[PDB]
Amino acid sequence: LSFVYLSYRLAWVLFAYVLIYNHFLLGDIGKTFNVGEWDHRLKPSAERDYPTRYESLYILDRTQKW
Amino acid sequence: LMMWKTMINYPESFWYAASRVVQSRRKKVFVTKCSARTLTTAGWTFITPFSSNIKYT
Amino acid sequence: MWGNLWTEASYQLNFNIGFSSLRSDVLIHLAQWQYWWWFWFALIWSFYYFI
Amino acid sequence: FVPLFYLGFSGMPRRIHDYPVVFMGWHSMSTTGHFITLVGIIFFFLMMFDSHIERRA
Amino acid sequence: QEREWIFEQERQNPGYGEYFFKDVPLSAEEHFNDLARGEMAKKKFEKPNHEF
Amino acid sequence: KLLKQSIYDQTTQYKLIKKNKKRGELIPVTLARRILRTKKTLVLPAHVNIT
Amino acid sequence: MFFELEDIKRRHSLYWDIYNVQGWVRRPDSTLYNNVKRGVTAGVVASLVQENITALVENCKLLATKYEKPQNLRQAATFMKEVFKLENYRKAVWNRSQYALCIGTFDIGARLATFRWLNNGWQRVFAGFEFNFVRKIPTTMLAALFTAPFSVPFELARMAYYGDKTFPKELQRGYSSYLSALARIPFEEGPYFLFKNSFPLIIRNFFQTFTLFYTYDFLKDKASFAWRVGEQNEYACKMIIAGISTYLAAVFSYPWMVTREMVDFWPKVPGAPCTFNGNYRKAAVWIWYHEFSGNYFAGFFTKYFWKASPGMFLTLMLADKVGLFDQTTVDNFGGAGNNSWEDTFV
Amino acid sequence: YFSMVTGLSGAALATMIRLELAHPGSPFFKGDSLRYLQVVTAHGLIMVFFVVVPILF
Amino acid sequence: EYDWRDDPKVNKDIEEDIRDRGWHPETYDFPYTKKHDDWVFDVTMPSQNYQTDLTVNIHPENKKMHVMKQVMRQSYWDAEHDMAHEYDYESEDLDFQCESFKSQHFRKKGPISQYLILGLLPILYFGTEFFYNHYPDEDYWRVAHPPPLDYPDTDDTDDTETFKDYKSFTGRRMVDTGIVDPLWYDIREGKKVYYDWAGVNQPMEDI
Numbered sequence: 001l002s003f004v005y006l007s008y009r010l011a012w013v014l015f016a017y018v019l020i021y022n023h024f025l026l027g028d029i030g031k032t033f034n035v036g037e038w039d040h041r042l043k044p045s046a047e048r049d050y051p052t053r054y055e056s057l058y059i060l061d062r063t064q065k066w
Numbered sequence: 067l068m069m070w071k072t073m074i075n076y077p078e079s080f081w082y083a084a085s086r087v088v089q090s091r092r093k094k095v096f097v098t099k100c101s102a103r104t105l106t107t108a109g110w111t112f113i114t115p116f117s118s119n120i121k122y123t
Numbered sequence: 124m125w126g127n128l129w130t131e132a133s134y135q136l137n138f139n140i141g142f143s144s145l146r147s148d149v150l151i152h153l154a155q156w157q158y159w160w161w162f163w164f165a166l167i168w169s170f171y172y173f174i
Numbered sequence: 175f176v177p178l179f180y181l182g183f184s185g186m187p188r189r190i191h192d193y194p195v196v197f198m199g200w201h202s203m204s205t206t207g208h209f210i211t212l213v214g215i216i217f218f219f220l221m222m223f224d225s226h227i228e229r230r231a
Numbered sequence: 232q233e234r235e236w237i238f239e240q241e242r243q244n245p246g247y248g249e250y251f252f253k254d255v256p257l258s259a260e261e262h263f264n265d266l267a268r269g270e271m272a273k274k275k276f277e278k279p280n281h282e283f
Numbered sequence: 284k285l286l287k288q289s290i291y292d293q294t295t296q297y298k299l300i301k302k303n304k305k306r307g308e309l310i311p312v313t314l315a316r317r318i319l320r321t322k323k324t325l326v327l328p329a330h331v332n333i334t
Numbered sequence: 335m336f337f338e339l340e341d342i343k344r345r346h347s348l349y350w351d352i353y354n355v356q357g358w359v360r361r362p363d364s365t366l367y368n369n370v371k372r373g374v375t376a377g378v379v380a381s382l383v384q385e386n387i388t389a390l391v392e393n394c395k396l397l398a399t400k401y402e403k404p405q406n407l408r409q410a411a412t413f414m415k416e417v418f419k420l421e422n423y424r425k426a427v428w429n430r431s432q433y434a435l436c437i438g439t440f441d442i443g444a445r446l447a448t449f450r451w452l453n454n455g456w457q458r459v460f461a462g463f464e465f466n467f468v469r470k471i472p473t474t475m476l477a478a479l480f481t482a483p484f485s486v487p488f489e490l491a492r493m494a495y496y497g498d499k500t501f502p503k504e505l506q507r508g509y510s511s512y513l514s515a516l517a518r519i520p521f522e523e524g525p526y527f528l529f530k531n532s533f534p535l536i537i538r539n540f541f542q543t544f545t546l547f548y549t550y551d552f553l554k555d556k557a558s559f560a561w562r563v564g565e566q567n568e569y570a571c572k573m574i575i576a577g578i579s580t581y582l583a584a585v586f587s588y589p590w591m592v593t594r595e596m597v598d599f600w601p602k603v604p605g606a607p608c609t610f611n612g613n614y615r616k617a618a619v620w621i622w623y624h625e626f627s628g629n630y631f632a633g634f635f636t637k638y639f640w641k642a643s644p645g646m647f648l649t650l651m652l653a654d655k656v657g658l659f660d661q662t663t664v665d666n667f668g669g670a671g672n673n674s675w676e677d678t679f680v
Numbered sequence: 681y682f683s684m685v686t687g688l689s690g691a692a693l694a695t696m697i698r699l700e701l702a703h704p705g706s707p708f709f710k711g712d713s714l715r716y717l718q719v720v721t722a723h724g725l726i727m728v729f730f731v732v733v734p735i736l737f
Numbered sequence: 738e739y740d741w742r743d744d745p746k747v748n749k750d751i752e753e754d755i756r757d758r759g760w761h762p763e764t765y766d767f768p769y770t771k772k773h774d775d776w777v778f779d780v781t782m783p784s785q786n787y788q789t790d791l792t793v794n795i796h797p798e799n800k801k802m803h804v805m806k807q808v809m810r811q812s813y814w815d816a817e818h819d820m821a822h823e824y825d826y827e828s829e830d831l832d833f834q835c836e837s838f839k840s841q842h843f844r845k846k847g848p849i850s851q852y853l854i855l856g857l858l859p860i861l862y863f864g865t866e867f868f869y870n871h872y873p874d875e876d877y878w879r880v881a882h883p884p885p886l887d888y889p890d891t892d893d894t895d896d897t898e899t900f901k902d903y904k905s906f907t908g909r910r911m912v913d914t915g916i917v918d919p920l921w922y923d924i925r926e927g928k929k930v931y932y933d934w935a936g937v938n939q940p941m942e943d944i
């Protein structure tokens with residue numbers, strides 16, 4: 001039942017978020033959206049490849065791999 | 067961005083310091099510097115190579 | 124304008140209803156064809172009226 | 175959609191947001207027609223509302 | 232009576248308000264006087280002594 | 284059709300045409316060109332074949 | 335504050351746009367005095383003509399019930415002369431002229447003034463048509479509502495005046511004229527005697543105002559190609575447009591005046607509860623939901639059309655002549671219409 | 681009902697298209713051609729694939 | 738369980754819908770089996786026999802008024818009954834179909850405020866999109882104002898330069914030719930004042 005209820009609650013809340021944001025909150029994209037990204041390890045770390053909600057605490061970077 | 071005491075505990079990106087913070091507006095049809103010349107669509111009939119190239123779309 | 128030779132061809136006014144110009148052979152042929160195409164409906168048209 | 179036929183006969187390309195000055199007239203009429211259509215759409219929804227105030231078999 | 236002041240700033244302006252006033256130095260970048268910009272940057276950082 | 288010497292300020296005439304020019308409802312496309320203006324013309328002969 | 339609510343006025347920094355000439359721009363002649371004067375003038379003229387028409391028609395019908403209708407044109411002229419000679423006709427002309435003044439200065443004039451006040455600033459496209467007419471739908475509607483009950487006290491005063499005229503001597507108020515009745519009723523039967531159960535009149539006025547004004551303005555703008563592209567008279571076109579608008583207003587306003595006939599004139603079934611409960615609004619709703627649209631259009635021309643339609647037609651014509659339907663059209667490229675002149679001519 | 685909502689969306693997109701073409705000079709998007717092209721493409725695609733096809737089928 | 742407050746006769750505050758005078762959706766059975774229609778005579782066509790009666794003429798235009806028969810009122814849902822009947826006892830109710838036809842899921846109408854929301858759906862959707870999302874931009878739907886004098890800069894709004902151009906020899910001659918419209922504003926003090934015939938609002942104050 002834990003998995004069932006987790007799935008159902010997440011589905012309902014995320015679907016409500018999708019509908020409300022895409023119908024009512026597109027006037028300011030910067031306010032209602034975050035810009036996120038993560039790229040390959042081969043390429044240098046992306047500008048948006050950082051943990052959200054901690055932009056004022058940490059600068060995230062990593063060593064490239066091949 | 068002058069006071070770090072308010073910035074340190076706020077769980078949001080620093081875009082609040084860049085979003086509509088100036089009164090300087092320029093209402094001229096010819097001065098529209100769009101997002102990027104390639105951020106367009108090729109109609110409901112996807113026409114190539116317009117549709118199939120990042121250089122153009 | 125090329126001297127006093129007005130090479131301009133359209134002279135298309137606002138609220139234009141037909142072709143932009145009729146100085147080309149293709150558009151003259153099309154205009155004549157359209158007019159006579161509309162000519163050849165009388166009987167059919169009349170028929171529907173009575174129906 | 176009749177003024178659109180008029181504009182098509184005069185050489186008006188499809189996907190241009192700016193057009194020669196000699197088209198505006200019919201374009202305005204075309205836009206007028208669209209708003210008329212919109213009014214009809216309103217009435218459509220109204221009748222559905224009016225259909226459930228009525229409540230007849 | 233403390234607040235999350237960036238949150239309060241976002242509350243005051245609902246995105247597309249016209250509140251850029253000359254009487255308010257912090258209303259916009261154009262209305263912040265140059266004397267304040269000069270005065271707030273007068274001091275200098277100390278140079279560390281690399282004693283290690 | 285004479286290239287006379289102008290007694291006006293040509294820049295002022297240009298800027299006054301740019302700012303506020305008289306227009307009307309039934310204005311020809313010859314006298315109302317806003318999107319159809321270029322700085323060069325492709326000149327070709329008439330009554331002959333061009334590939 | 336001055337009470338529980340504070341109207342918090344605020345200051346805002348300036349804004350501007352590329353174009354200035356197709357939104358709301360209040361006209362310089364839209365002052366209260368000018369609108370009131372023009373609306374009152376047009377209303378009183380139209381109402382005087384309409385009431386003279388009504389008096390003449392009804393006194394001709396009164397004479398025709400006692401003498402045979404004329405056979406030829408000479409007999410028609412004699413019949414009309416005898417109608418004019420009638421004692422009943424002259425007093426009717428006088429009292430209905432007073433009624434026309436009252437309903438022109440306060441009902442038709444008020445409708446015209448409110449419509450102009452609310453709709454003066456809607457500008458039109460330069461060499462096209464006003465595509466965004468939907469913005470006028472609420473505006474015009476408001477006017478109709480705000481002027482719906484302005485004719486009710488005068489109409490009910492006229493009804494009371496004639497009802498007094500038709501009673502025995504001992505049961506008469508002795509109203510010398512229509513103005514005397516209008517001045518005396520609120521201090522004898524109370525102000526509510528001029529407003530009680532007036533839903534038919536209110537909704538009829540609403541539909542008259544909205545249909546007439548909206549249809550006339552819309553057609554006089556959208557059918558403007560009839561005399562701009564293909565050159566026609568524009569005066570015959572304006573008259574045709576006014577006639578169409580008047581016919582539509584009369585059609586959309588009449589069914590609400592049948593509720594009077596249905597409620598307190600149709601014979602009642604003995605021993606059964608009265609249908610519509612004598613409300614005129616339950617009757618109006620039943621008419622709105624009735625399946626046969628011809629049942630509440632009987633008597634359209636006998637009872638209502640020739641008592642409102644000429645008045646509405648002349649109201650439209652005179653309002654257009656004086657200038658209550660004029661809208662400002664300014665070139666959207668040159669001069670004050672544009673804030674980006676560099677793209678005007680390129 | 682979903683088709684009613686999507687048809688209203690398509691009607692709004694068509695309203696944007698007609699407001700841009702009401703008169704020359706780009707009164708609606710104010711010189712942003714790419715946004716107009718996106719609006720036209722979205723209008724066509726959601727009117728064909730997400731209004732008429734949902735309603736009918 | 739009789740509550741006189743729910744009785745339309747005793748409780749005068751229960752307003753009667755005259756369009757539902759002969760119809761009581763509370764008493765509708767499902768499936769409906771009432772017979773409210775039958776032969777109607779003696780309205781205009783008498784039920785008696787006067788076909789050969791020479792002393793009797795039938796005048797149907799003398800039809801007498803009868804009680805108006807309203808169009809049938811649709812059934813109204815009973816919330817408790819509908820929830821109870823359609824309820825299923827999971828894991829202890831067999832997945833089967835009852836033999837009786839009363840187990841059919843009949844549709845009954847309900848509230849109307851939801852359809853009040855539906856009736857204004859185009860208005861609400863267009864308002865939401867254009868106004869709430871501020872599409873295409875903030876300034877499009879606002880009442881149009883020209884910029885103040887030389888605002889934001891003379892490169893964009895060269896009001897003084899144009900004022901001088903119209904007031905010079907070349908400008909006066911160009912206006913004389915008739916191809917250039919007259920000047921539409923006046924620079925009084927430091928304020929640009931548009932003429933009444935210009936057909937534009939006045940510029941906003943620089944607050």
Ligand code: HEA
Pocket residue numbers: 108109110111188189190191208211215681683684685687688690691694697698720721723724725727728731732735
């Ligand atoms: C489904 C087909 C469909 C519909 C309905 C519409 C609707 C409309 N279209 Fe659209 N249009 C297209 C198909 C359609 N279009 C296509 C394929 C293109 C090509 C795109 C491109 O070029 O790549 C296009 C592009 C297009 C352009 C091109 C712009 C450009 O080229 O510069 C224009 C401009 O005039 C236009 C105009 C209109 C107008 C005024 C309407 C109006 O009629 C809008 C009317 C509104 C309604 C029809 C809404 C329906 C009502 C409901 C609420 C439905 C729900 C009801 C029930 C459930 C029954 N359309």
Ligand SMILES: CCCCCCCCCCCCCCCCCC(=O)OC[C@H](COP(=O)([O-])OCC[N+](C)(C)C)OC(=O)CCCCCCCCCCCCCCCCC
Pocket residue numbers: 209212216356357358466468469472695859860861863864865867868869877878879880881
């Ligand atoms: C949390 C819930 C949020 C809900 C969403 C937000 C609110 C939605 C409800 C709004 C109700 C309506 C308010 C209207 C007030 C209008 C006042 C006014 O004068 O406005 C001037 C405006 C603008 O008129 P204009 O023509 O002068 O402006 C055009 C732009 N310029 C200035 C450049 C010329 O008028 C309108 O917008 C018309 C309103 C008519 C009524 C319909 C409103 C909804 C649709 C509006 C979009 C346009 C399409 C219309 C046709 C299709 C309709 C389906």
